[PDB]
Design a protein around this ligand. Sequence first.
Ligand SMILES: *[C@@H]1O[C@H](CO)[C@@H](O[C@@H]2O[C@H](CO[C@H]3O[C@H](CO)[C@@H](O)[C@H](O)[C@@H]3O)[C@@H](O[C@H]3O[C@H](CO)[C@@H](O)[C@H](O)[C@@H]3O)[C@H](O[C@@H]3O[C@H](CS(=O)(=O)O)[C@@H](O[C@@H]4O[C@H](CO)[C@@H](O)[C@H](O)[C@H]4O)[C@H](O)[C@H]3O)[C@H]2NC(C)=O)[C@H](O)[C@H]1NC(C)=O
Ligand SMILES: *[C@@H]1O[C@H](CO)[C@@H](O[C@@H]2O[C@H](CO[C@H]3O[C@H](CO)[C@@H](O)[C@H](O)[C@@H]3O)[C@@H](O[C@H]3O[C@H](CO)[C@@H](O)[C@H](O)[C@@H]3O)[C@H](O[C@@H]3O[C@H](CS(=O)(=O)O)[C@@H](O[C@@H]4O[C@H](CO)[C@@H](O)[C@H](O)[C@H]4O)[C@H](O)[C@H]3O)[C@H]2NC(C)=O)[C@H](O)[C@H]1NC(C)=O
Ligand SMILES: *[C@@H]1O[C@H](CO)[C@@H](O[C@@H]2O[C@H](CO[C@H]3O[C@H](CO)[C@@H](O)[C@H](O)[C@@H]3O)[C@@H](O[C@H]3O[C@H](CO)[C@@H](O)[C@H](O)[C@@H]3O)[C@H](O[C@@H]3O[C@H](CS(=O)(=O)O)[C@@H](O[C@@H]4O[C@H](CO)[C@@H](O)[C@H](O)[C@H]4O)[C@H](O)[C@H]3O)[C@H]2NC(C)=O)[C@H](O)[C@H]1NC(C)=O
Ligand SMILES: *[C@@H]1O[C@H](CO)[C@@H](O[C@@H]2O[C@H](CO[C@H]3O[C@H](CO)[C@@H](O)[C@H](O)[C@@H]3O)[C@@H](O[C@H]3O[C@H](CO)[C@@H](O)[C@H](O)[C@@H]3O)[C@H](O[C@@H]3O[C@H](CS(=O)(=O)O)[C@@H](O)[C@H](O)[C@H]3O)[C@H]2NC(C)=O)[C@H](O)[C@H]1NC(C)=O
Ligand SMILES: *[C@@H]1O[C@H](CO)[C@@H](O[C@@H]2O[C@H](CO[C@H]3O[C@H](CO)[C@@H](O)[C@H](O)[C@@H]3O)[C@@H](O[C@H]3O[C@H](CO)[C@@H](O)[C@H](O)[C@@H]3O)[C@H](O[C@@H]3O[C@H](CS(=O)(=O)O)[C@@H](O)[C@H](O)[C@H]3O)[C@H]2NC(C)=O)[C@H](O)[C@H]1NC(C)=O
Ligand SMILES: *[C@@H]1O[C@H](CO)[C@@H](O[C@@H]2O[C@H](CO[C@H]3O[C@H](CO)[C@@H](O)[C@H](O)[C@@H]3O)[C@@H](O[C@H]3O[C@H](CO)[C@@H](O)[C@H](O)[C@@H]3O)[C@H](O[C@@H]3O[C@H](CS(=O)(=O)O)[C@@H](O)[C@H](O)[C@H]3O)[C@H]2NC(C)=O)[C@H](O)[C@H]1NC(C)=O
Ligand SMILES: *[C@@H]1O[C@H](CO)[C@@H](O[C@@H]2O[C@H](CO[C@H]3O[C@H](CO)[C@@H](O)[C@H](O)[C@@H]3O)[C@@H](O)[C@H](O[C@@H]3O[C@H](CS(=O)(=O)O)[C@@H](O)[C@H](O)[C@H]3O)[C@H]2NC(C)=O)[C@H](O)[C@H]1NC(C)=O
Ligand SMILES: *[C@@H]1O[C@H](CO)[C@@H](O[C@@H]2O[C@H](CO[C@H]3O[C@H](CO)[C@@H](O)[C@H](O)[C@@H]3O)[C@@H](O)[C@H](O[C@@H]3O[C@H](CS(=O)(=O)O)[C@@H](O)[C@H](O)[C@H]3O)[C@H]2NC(C)=O)[C@H](O)[C@H]1NC(C)=O
Ligand SMILES: *[C@@H]1O[C@H](CO)[C@@H](O[C@@H]2O[C@H](CO[C@H]3O[C@H](CO)[C@@H](O)[C@H](O)[C@@H]3O)[C@@H](O[C@H]3O[C@H](CO)[C@@H](O)[C@H](O)[C@@H]3O)[C@H](O)[C@H]2NC(C)=O)[C@H](O)[C@H]1NC(C)=O
Ligand SMILES: *[C@@H]1O[C@H](CO)[C@@H](O[C@@H]2O[C@H](CO[C@H]3O[C@H](CO)[C@@H](O)[C@H](O)[C@@H]3O)[C@@H](O)[C@H](O)[C@H]2NC(C)=O)[C@H](O)[C@H]1NC(C)=O
Ligand SMILES: *[C@@H]1O[C@H](CO)[C@@H](O[C@@H]2O[C@H](CO)[C@@H](O)[C@H](O)[C@H]2NC(C)=O)[C@H](O)[C@H]1NC(C)=O
Length: 1040
Amino acid sequence: LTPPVSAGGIQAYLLTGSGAPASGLVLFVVNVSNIQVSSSNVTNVISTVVSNIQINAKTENAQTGATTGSVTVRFPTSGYNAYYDSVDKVVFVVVSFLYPYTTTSVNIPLSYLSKYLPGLLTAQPYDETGAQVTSVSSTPFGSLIDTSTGQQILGTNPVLTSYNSYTTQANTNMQEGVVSGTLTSFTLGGQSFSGSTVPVILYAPFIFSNSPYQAGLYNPMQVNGNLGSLSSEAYYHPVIWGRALINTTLIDTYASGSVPFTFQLNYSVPGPLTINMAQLAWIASINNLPTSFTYLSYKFSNGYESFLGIISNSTQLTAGALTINPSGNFTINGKKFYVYLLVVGSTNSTTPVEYVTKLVVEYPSSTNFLPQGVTVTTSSNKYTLPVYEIGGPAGTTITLTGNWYSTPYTVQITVGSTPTLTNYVSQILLKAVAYEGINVSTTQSPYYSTAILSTPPSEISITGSSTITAQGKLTATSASATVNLLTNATLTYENIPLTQYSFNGIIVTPGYAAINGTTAMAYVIGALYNKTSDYVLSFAGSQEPMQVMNNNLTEVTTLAPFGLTLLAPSVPATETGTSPLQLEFFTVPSTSYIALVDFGLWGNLTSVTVSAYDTVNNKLSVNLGYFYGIVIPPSISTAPYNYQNFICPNNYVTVTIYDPDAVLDPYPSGSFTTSSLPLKYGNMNITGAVIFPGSSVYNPSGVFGYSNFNKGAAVTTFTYTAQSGPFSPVALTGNTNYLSQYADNNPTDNYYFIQTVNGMPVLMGGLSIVASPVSASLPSSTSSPGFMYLLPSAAQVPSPLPGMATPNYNLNIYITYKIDGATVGNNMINGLYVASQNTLIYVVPNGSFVGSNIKLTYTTTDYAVLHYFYSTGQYKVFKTVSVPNVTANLYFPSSTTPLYQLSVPLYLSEPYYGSPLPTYIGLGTNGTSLWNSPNYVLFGVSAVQQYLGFIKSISVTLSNGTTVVIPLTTSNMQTLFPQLVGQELQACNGTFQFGISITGLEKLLNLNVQQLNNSILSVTYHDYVTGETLTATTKLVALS
Ligand SMILES: *[C@@H]1O[C@H](CO)[C@@H](O[C@@H]2O[C@H](CO[C@H]3O[C@H](CO)[C@@H](O)[C@H](O)[C@@H]3O)[C@@H](O[C@H]3O[C@H](CO)[C@@H](O)[C@H](O)[C@@H]3O)[C@H](O[C@@H]3O[C@H](CS(=O)(=O)O)[C@@H](O[C@@H]4O[C@H](CO)[C@@H](O)[C@H](O)[C@H]4O)[C@H](O)[C@H]3O)[C@H]2NC(C)=O)[C@H](O)[C@H]1NC(C)=O
Ligand SMILES: *[C@@H]1O[C@H](CO)[C@@H](O[C@@H]2O[C@H](CO[C@H]3O[C@H](CO)[C@@H](O)[C@H](O)[C@@H]3O)[C@@H](O[C@H]3O[C@H](CO)[C@@H](O)[C@H](O)[C@@H]3O)[C@H](O[C@@H]3O[C@H](CS(=O)(=O)O)[C@@H](O[C@@H]4O[C@H](CO)[C@@H](O)[C@H](O)[C@H]4O)[C@H](O)[C@H]3O)[C@H]2NC(C)=O)[C@H](O)[C@H]1NC(C)=O
Ligand SMILES: *[C@@H]1O[C@H](CO)[C@@H](O[C@@H]2O[C@H](CO[C@H]3O[C@H](CO)[C@@H](O)[C@H](O)[C@@H]3O)[C@@H](O[C@H]3O[C@H](CO)[C@@H](O)[C@H](O)[C@@H]3O)[C@H](O[C@@H]3O[C@H](CS(=O)(=O)O)[C@@H](O[C@@H]4O[C@H](CO)[C@@H](O)[C@H](O)[C@H]4O)[C@H](O)[C@H]3O)[C@H]2NC(C)=O)[C@H](O)[C@H]1NC(C)=O
Ligand SMILES: *[C@@H]1O[C@H](CO)[C@@H](O[C@@H]2O[C@H](CO[C@H]3O[C@H](CO)[C@@H](O)[C@H](O)[C@@H]3O)[C@@H](O[C@H]3O[C@H](CO)[C@@H](O)[C@H](O)[C@@H]3O)[C@H](O[C@@H]3O[C@H](CS(=O)(=O)O)[C@@H](O)[C@H](O)[C@H]3O)[C@H]2NC(C)=O)[C@H](O)[C@H]1NC(C)=O
Ligand SMILES: *[C@@H]1O[C@H](CO)[C@@H](O[C@@H]2O[C@H](CO[C@H]3O[C@H](CO)[C@@H](O)[C@H](O)[C@@H]3O)[C@@H](O[C@H]3O[C@H](CO)[C@@H](O)[C@H](O)[C@@H]3O)[C@H](O[C@@H]3O[C@H](CS(=O)(=O)O)[C@@H](O)[C@H](O)[C@H]3O)[C@H]2NC(C)=O)[C@H](O)[C@H]1NC(C)=O
Ligand SMILES: *[C@@H]1O[C@H](CO)[C@@H](O[C@@H]2O[C@H](CO[C@H]3O[C@H](CO)[C@@H](O)[C@H](O)[C@@H]3O)[C@@H](O[C@H]3O[C@H](CO)[C@@H](O)[C@H](O)[C@@H]3O)[C@H](O[C@@H]3O[C@H](CS(=O)(=O)O)[C@@H](O)[C@H](O)[C@H]3O)[C@H]2NC(C)=O)[C@H](O)[C@H]1NC(C)=O
Ligand SMILES: *[C@@H]1O[C@H](CO)[C@@H](O[C@@H]2O[C@H](CO[C@H]3O[C@H](CO)[C@@H](O)[C@H](O)[C@@H]3O)[C@@H](O)[C@H](O[C@@H]3O[C@H](CS(=O)(=O)O)[C@@H](O)[C@H](O)[C@H]3O)[C@H]2NC(C)=O)[C@H](O)[C@H]1NC(C)=O
Ligand SMILES: *[C@@H]1O[C@H](CO)[C@@H](O[C@@H]2O[C@H](CO[C@H]3O[C@H](CO)[C@@H](O)[C@H](O)[C@@H]3O)[C@@H](O)[C@H](O[C@@H]3O[C@H](CS(=O)(=O)O)[C@@H](O)[C@H](O)[C@H]3O)[C@H]2NC(C)=O)[C@H](O)[C@H]1NC(C)=O
Ligand SMILES: *[C@@H]1O[C@H](CO)[C@@H](O[C@@H]2O[C@H](CO[C@H]3O[C@H](CO)[C@@H](O)[C@H](O)[C@@H]3O)[C@@H](O[C@H]3O[C@H](CO)[C@@H](O)[C@H](O)[C@@H]3O)[C@H](O)[C@H]2NC(C)=O)[C@H](O)[C@H]1NC(C)=O
Ligand SMILES: *[C@@H]1O[C@H](CO)[C@@H](O[C@@H]2O[C@H](CO[C@H]3O[C@H](CO)[C@@H](O)[C@H](O)[C@@H]3O)[C@@H](O)[C@H](O)[C@H]2NC(C)=O)[C@H](O)[C@H]1NC(C)=O
Ligand SMILES: *[C@@H]1O[C@H](CO)[C@@H](O[C@@H]2O[C@H](CO)[C@@H](O)[C@H](O)[C@H]2NC(C)=O)[C@H](O)[C@H]1NC(C)=O
């Protein structure tokens, strides 16, 4: 039992799961293990306990939590059912609250109940009245006594009426039922009883939860105070960036165990957008093409080429020695027409260049002028039509001859020198819809908690409405016309005779950078001029969206046709007309985020509505969830550093990068993957994205929701692993072809996620480092994605939601010289290194330390930031860390020093020599200074003997003004310095102490003991680290 029931306490549990007898059953238990019970007194103990139970029954509005009716009830003195189990030592009662068993009792098999009361398989329960029995019967709710009244609960009472009617009540009125119990405190057999149950929910509708989060979704990072102004409104206006997960909670009382949920997301922007569109192909009857023109086919991002489509009555097109066979045929009321599809390019070719897979031509019906359509097929009735190439060197001309009806026509193409691109630019009221699925489980029914993507890598349908308009001149024998569509696309008709058709039309594709040629839409418009009572020129047009895959341009669906009619009773006339027109583009999966940024549907003004479906039970949400879109630029900063940040092994410099758009998963160290499939939603099967938590990428099969669904072997598993070399880097391992299906929180690999087309990422984002004067860089040309395991910091305990991510990334930088030239196996320590999770180490030679520097550049990971801030440059940020110069010093303790004393200390000081104790500087030869530091270690590498300076000269200037310069030799030093080593005095304070010895100095000069030696002593030292030459002096004194 979860939760447990205390000594003499009361608790309640809902009967659920497989084999559960009916809905709306709750089990109450009181713990009676605290005393002995026997066949002699069992009737008295159950009677005593069940007398003291009180039950409270409520109805509520499921969104707001407002109470809408409440009753409180007590068991009668006879006619109830209550039991005792000897094995588990508990008294129990089952109450039935909901239809149909509100007034009548229901029977619960003892096999089932053993889940909660396992003792029941060991011995049969005691009944009331002391018997034992094999089966349990509910006490019905409609039998209990109203404590308000002292009588049986009324049949007319609103709570009982509601519970008896719950199916339509929950759906229509958003009603929820809630029940709880308590035991009025009493003493029995020398023990005492007291308590109150947890409440339980009997029924509730399928909704997004709206308390405390009023919108049904939330972003943890905004609820905690981390986004500035935006934290004022986190409970009713959630914001999220393009590729990340947003958290949500659903209430579901139909569910048991795990459930697949499918979701539908609708995107919208205030007011119309300006869209840029390129012409993929041009289709016309041979009468409508101009007599002479210049053309060369454009080549799109996916390799597809623009084509020119001629329709004619002739069984071939003829061009001298070359003849072209038709790609396909169609018939209209017994007349037969042929379609020729051509690419103008390099050389006349007899094999297919590429294909078009279904193609609808629309025409006005002869009877009624309503639209009708036919699909063009090959001469053996297969649907895929081939496209041919004609061409030659630039300025070569090709004449094609064909027929329209009875009349021969010639067209004269000149092979252009540069690709013909036609751009149309229009204003359209765009919107888009997308679909997504996840598998969710819970330990706290009926609450299902989960997170869903901001933008899924599914097919996404971008959709919008526009206008077509026609103008026309009609006459006794022929008619002439023009049409406009997509703001500035124009089509024209050569004069159409009475009873004859003519065709024209265009196929268009998005004119943006990465995605062009991957999706298209086709309009083919036929015209007919005929005499009735009135003269009628009629137009009919197809509308079909298409996609390119493996060089077939293929039909996705057909939308409805459209039609326009111009009517004249007068013989000569001019007329005009209009119709609505529709536009639809289906994205190919990898392109889906780029499309939404490019068209303008994703940005600071966008708003999204979400609905949800349970795939086990076939239910839809009775409310909708809401969220809003945001784009935020990066920023870089550093904590203030002096020279002290570079002395001893525990000192370092901290750089903080702020970039919320790099946090795709609200949990730090979290991971997920994604794949595309058909999903069940409503009563239909629709292409969508399925999210899998973890670090393995899958190629699934079947339809998500049904029992076909099978995710196969893991195609690739990504992991961060330790590696060889010094220190030990942690870096990403796994097949890089699949990074466009993996999400983490690391900016050194997050830039691939839904931003990779043709196998190359659109934005080379992340962190880049350069170092000087020892030239090094990361990433190097050979370096993989994920060269270090950089992750964001977690929100701490005073925050409302701890352990969740923060937009700050903290990077630690160390610069040092003490371990330069160390070796770790085969490795030589010099240059720039990654260490641990968030650490960089730079090791440089002694002579290059002051002035050494690192320059860090951070570029955004998200394509929306690159797009909206390209011009201003706010998508990159830079910082540089460098080692400052410091003032060293050498000094005898006092200006005057007495000759009486045998040794007079000379102290050297320079901050950058400091280390943990002990450390010492040795002297010898021509005054060479050697530094040793045995206790120094940095990430496992330990310090090496360094050569850091020299004593340059030592001199005495005597009382007659003569100056003596003492030559440094292996013999002279040992007298002047009796110990050849100077020790450091305290930890990390570089101040070394040496014993220049007067007793030695006398003998080394042979100068008269004191009588000559009212003199100035001098010493000088050069250090390589700073470059300074220090000097110190003292007047040697005695009575003179
Ligand atoms: C989408 O909308 C987002 C939310 O507003 C925008 O994010 C914000 O970006 C600002 C910088 O970019 C702005 O400036 C460029 C041109 O230079 C233009 O593209 C836009 O104008 C764009 O908004 C940045 O705001 C700062 O610059 C503003 C200049 O326009 C200025 O008005 C602000 O006052 C800021 O100086 C935001 O960065 C945050 O700014 C807030 C200030 S406030 O909340 O905006 O008032 C800081 O909060 C403050 O923190 C200090 C701590 O010391 C407190 O003392 C103080 O009480 C508190 O207000 C944040 O620290 C700072 O990060 C940035 N907002 C967020 C969410 O970080 C985004 O650019 C819009 N996108 C587009 C497409 O433009
Ligand atoms: C694809 O296949 C196409 C169909 O056969 C070829 O088209 C033909 O192109 C000819 C030019 O191609 C030649 O030159 C290029 C270099 O630019 C080479 O790469 C080719 O190998 C080839 O040698 C074109 O001829 C015209 O241009 C010539 C320039 O070299 C020159 O002879 C004349 O200036 C030509 O006008 C064909 O166009 C037709 O040519 C005939 C004559 S002929 O067939 O060339 O002998 C003309 O008839 C003449 O009309 C004049 C009117 O002034 C009369 O005075 C004369 O009595 C009469 O003969 C036609 O008017 C003219 O249209 C052209 N054929 C057609 C009809 O399309 C193409 O080369 C192939 N591409 C490749 C290289 O694969
Ligand atoms: C907002 O929504 C986020 C959805 O992305 C939620 O993130 C998920 O967080 C889980 C832990 O959160 C718990 O603790 C926080 C406090 O930090 C509480 O606020 C939460 O209420 C909750 O109690 C996290 O679960 C994992 O970590 C747990 C340790 O805390 C551990 O007990 C679990 O067993 C999990 O490992 C989710 O992280 C991922 O979890 C999946 C498994 S599952 O989704 O939990 O079932 C792991 O996948 C597995 O990986 C192993 C590899 O060992 C494979 O063998 C196995 O095949 C595969 O299933 C992931 O590796 C692991 O990262 C985390 N979900 C994701 C996808 O990141 C977040 O909590 C929500 N916020 C709130 C406030 O509720
Ligand atoms: C383009 O011309 C093609 C011929 O060059 C046409 O292909 C022939 O289509 C026949 C009729 O089917 C078509 O009905 C409409 C006509 O355009 C149109 O909606 C569709 O294109 C639709 O496919 C087709 O016959 C069908 O019915 C036969 C019953 O007699 C049956 O035997 C076939 O299996 C088929 O379903 C032709 O197939 C040929 O049928 C021959 C018998 S007969 O139809 O000549 O009486 C028989 O020898 C053999 O089965 C088969 O060769 C088919 N003809 C050829 C040569 O493949 C095509 O429809 C035109 N396209 C359009 C759209 O106009
Ligand atoms: C369809 O797909 C193609 C593939 O992605 C596009 O070709 C690439 O276009 C780049 C810029 O795109 C913009 O300008 C086009 C006109 O030049 C325009 O048609 C697009 O709609 C879009 O607005 C093009 O960059 C060139 O043009 C820039 C002017 O905007 C100019 O600044 C550049 O110097 C360059 O001349 C790509 O060429 C590539 O440029 C790379 C730098 S970047 O400009 O992309 O940042 C450079 O690293 C690379 O070496 C170079 O090749 C060009 N890419 C290729 C592979 O050719 C094509 O334009 C799209 N066409 C349509 C119908 O819009
Ligand atoms: C690093 O190590 C050095 C070891 O040589 C330290 O030098 C010693 O510093 C003492 C005072 O330091 C304090 O005041 C500084 C400003 O004056 C300040 O920058 C420091 O950060 C620190 O706050 C100095 O003591 C003098 O002042 C005392 C009162 O404050 C006075 O009591 C002493 O008699 C003296 O006047 C030391 O001076 C020498 O002291 C010898 C006695 S003892 O101090 O060892 O007990 C005495 O026999 C001698 O005659 C006198 O010269 C001084 N040591 C030396 C050899 O000069 C230094 O502060 C450390 N720096 C840091 C930043 O850690
Ligand atoms: C397109 O131009 C072609 C040229 O090849 C021409 O073909 C002619 O076909 C008719 C049959 O007409 C039937 O089909 C068409 C649709 O294909 C329908 O519109 C009609 O209602 C009919 O059902 C043949 O009668 C022609 O055969 C030729 O006759 C020539 C003399 S002619 O004076 O009769 O034209 C002879 O020289 C040829 O030997 C013989 O093959 C045929 N015409 C030609 C010259 O091949 C159609 O007229 C044109 N179709 C349309 C849509 O107008
Ligand atoms: C720290 O950096 C200083 C300055 O760059 C460097 O001084 C250079 O000293 C070498 C000799 O040092 C060698 O022996 C000692 C043993 O005492 C070892 O500890 C060292 O590891 C070395 O093996 C001298 O060769 C340099 O003097 C000048 O060299 C020039 C050429 S260079 O390429 O070697 O620099 C000549 O052209 C000049 O004529 C000559 O004066 C000296 N460098 C300079 C420019 O003064 C130390 O070795 C470094 N200390 C350590 C241990 O890193
Ligand atoms: C300042 O007073 C000093 C003490 O009297 C003198 O310098 C010392 O005297 C040493 C020897 O006497 C004379 O030699 C120097 C140099 O040759 C002469 O310039 C003066 O006449 C000195 O009095 C002297 O030793 C040096 O010279 C001798 C040879 O005479 C050599 O054997 C030695 O190797 C050495 O080169 C030194 O200059 C100094 N000795 C000591 C112990 O310090 C001198 O009177 C005057 N200084 C000078 C040199 O003018
Ligand atoms: C668009 O044209 C495509 C030609 O590359 C074609 O894809 C190939 O289909 C074959 C099996 O289909 C047969 O029929 C087609 C008729 O279009 C033939 O072109 C093809 O050679 C086959 O005989 C299959 O092996 C594979 O999916 C494709 N072949 C390659 C190159 O891998 C499509 O059938 C066509 N339209 C679509 C997508 O339906
Ligand atoms: C019910 O019956 C048993 C006797 O069958 C009671 O147990 C005795 O209680 C007394 C004091 O209450 C103890 O001193 C004895 O140890 C018990 N005797 C036996 C035979 O076990 C039990 O307490 C009774 N329960 C109630 C609530 O009356």
